Chain length 217, copies 2
């Protein structure tokens, strides 16, 4: 019940989809990590990766310049290690010295940086989508969160990496995309709406979902 | 590798030996080891993975147990059975779902500033709502599996050890230093070196944490 099934399924949609509607993007998907690559990264960060994340890495070791997730790049294992260490330095500096918030409330620690937030996606401008290994009291271990430079408010966008990948795969299959050969961007088809930043889409979806679940105790 | 497993084993030797030579009755409250499947079942129930030093401790004693119409090993505070750990964790998980003066941490940002967290596993109890336990969800300047105080009267949480091993060992060092009074009789803390007064062990741990933070 870890989201491994979802990860494998999703990568199929995404592998098939890219090869059909954007080969240039397909070609940036790297070879699988070896178990040793993963072990070495776990040793370096002193962390245990969630099953669905390891499953994802054993399919593609990130991307080798045009973001797969509507412009946002899937990070290589080496990039994940390096960036985690970069966030860990930032955290150290803050510990030896705007208001940070969470949606849902108390799901994510109200802090700028945490050693246990492992970035998997980057916008190459300081913001990420990653796996949270130190949830707030109303969060879940290995929930998927947004965090980074411009994320004073953190959002939980998925229950695991599998559900995140699959919901991205569902967006592609639903036709919620525009090509700008060109760059992949998001548009909501059913509504015939404008191009939107995928972060804003994820944020609104999180916010909507939270609001519709509030009534149930 | 450096999980503190060694420390746990070493500590339990001193504590087994000490109790036996000084307070037989207390030593008799130390339960038989926990079996591996007992643990597995507890890990399944809480959907959590115990740290090595904690598992190591449980595979030496499954907490304490008495039949007096009890008697905390940690200067009055009782080492919890696995069954008690499971039950109490689920009780704190209920509290967390239902959810307070200002919640705080020493060191700052080591422990989440919250009343209750599902990943705080109680190992010791004062039987009045307060605990020592293992923190499986540290703040950004904390360490995974650090030992913390939390519960009814701990609006401020204290990190008292880097792992369960170091905690047990520092308790063993207190015994061997002679920092104790028996009131057979109940075990209480006193700092022998400075001929100090009898004090609550929580207060001792709190001051030590506070001093350690200031010197760092």
């Amino acid at each position: 019940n870890d989201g491994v099934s979802e990860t494998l399924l999703a990568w199929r949609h995404i592998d098939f989809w890219t090869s059909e509607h954007n080969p240039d993007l397909n070609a940036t998907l790297s070879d699988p990590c070896t178990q040793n690559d993963i072990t070495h990264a776990e040793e370096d960060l002193e962390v245990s990766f969630p099953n669905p994340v390891k499953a994802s890495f054993k399919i593609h070791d990130g991307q080798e310049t045009s973001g797969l997730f509507y412009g946002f790049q899937l990070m290589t294992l080496d990039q994940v290690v390096a960036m985690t260490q970069a966030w860990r330095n930032v955290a150290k500096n803050l510990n030896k010295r705007p208001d940070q918030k969470s949606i849902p409330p108390n799901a994510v620690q109200p802090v700028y940086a945490h050693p246990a937030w492992i970035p998997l996606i980057t916008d190459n401008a300081g913001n990420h989508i990653g796996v949270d290994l130190a949830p707030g009291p109303n969060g879940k271990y290995a929930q998927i969160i947004t965090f980074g430079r411009d994320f004073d408010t953190k959002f939980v966008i998925a229950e695991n990496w599998g559900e995140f990948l699959l919901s991205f795969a569902n967006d592609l299959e639903a036709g919620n995309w525009y090509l700008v050969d060109g760059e992949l961007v998001f548009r909501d088809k059913k509504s015939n709406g404008p191009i939107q930043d995928y972060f804003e889409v994820l944020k609104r979806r999180t916010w909507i979902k939270y609001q519709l679940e509030r009534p149930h105790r």
